[PDB]
Write a protein that binds this ligand. Structure first.
Ligand code: RQD
Ligand code: MG
Lengths: 150, 151
């Protein structure tokens, strides 16, 4: 169906962008809103309400640029805003070598049903936060499975 | 001012802030503002954005060596319609010989539409505008803003 094709296109755009940033160790934080509304966090960023493309996602997270500091929040198959605040988790059970991107992802996943993707600037490793847990060192296939399950 | 007029002022502020940033840093840019002649055929050659304007997004688009920086951004009213768009190259002899493809594209679209195109030179940081087949170079910030306000 059209809705199915659209979801698959968005998944492909996300994984292409994450693959580019993982290879270049570009830090990134991308939260996908689900049933829990995230408007209060969306309002903290720069409004975009933009079509998703791998190109735009990459251009957003380029280091040393206006939009790269904070989270992209996606809602209704669009990029709602960039450079958004997410709350930092205080969980003592996050790997101690991880910093604030990952604690922000876990933080929002504590208080919403959202799925957040993190690319590490240290390693290029890719992780996902959901339900208060961080799933680390994902392959491309693992991230796709998580996006399709979501 | 009405909401339409306030929105236009916000859009002009975003554009001028972005252009000023990119001029200082010698970041090449090519930004076409659609007016009454529709540019859909050119918009369709780019990557669709249909995004709300901000100075931040405009700057991020044109950062060198990124997916969206090559080609034109085309704006429709208060939205960035698409980036990395094709524009036709002018053959006009009144384009300074040292100028490259961004200025020739801007004059090109200005020959077949009523649009206003802003160009930042990656060589000098100079700001120019193309409109109605003419290129006006080395604009001050004040001149650019007045041109946009008049547009
Ligand atoms: C060298 O390649 C890698 O680091 C990947 N295994 C990481 C990676 C994970 C998800 C994705 F959508 C793209 C890339
Ligand atoms: Mg002069």
């Amino acid at each position: 169906t059209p809705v199915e094709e659209a979801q698959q296109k968005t998944i492909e755009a996300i994984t292409k962008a994450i693959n580019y940033m993982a290879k270049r160790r570009i830090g990134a934080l991308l939260t996908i809103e689900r049933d829990t509304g995230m408007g209060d966090y969306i309002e903290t960023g720069i409004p975009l309400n933009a079509k998703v493309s791998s190109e735009l996602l990459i251009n957003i997270f380029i280091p040393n640029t206006p939009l790269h500091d904070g989270a992209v929040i996606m809602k209704n198959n669009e990029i709602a805003a960039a450079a958004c605040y997410l709350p930092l988790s205080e969980s003592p059970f996050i790997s101690k070598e991880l910093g604030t991107r990952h604690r922000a992802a876990v933080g929002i996943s504590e208080v919403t049903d959202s799925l957040t993707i993190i690319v590490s600037e240290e390693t290029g490793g890719v992780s996902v936060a959901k339900n208060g847990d961080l799933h680390r060192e994902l392959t491309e296939e693992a991230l796709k499975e998580m996006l399709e399950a979501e």
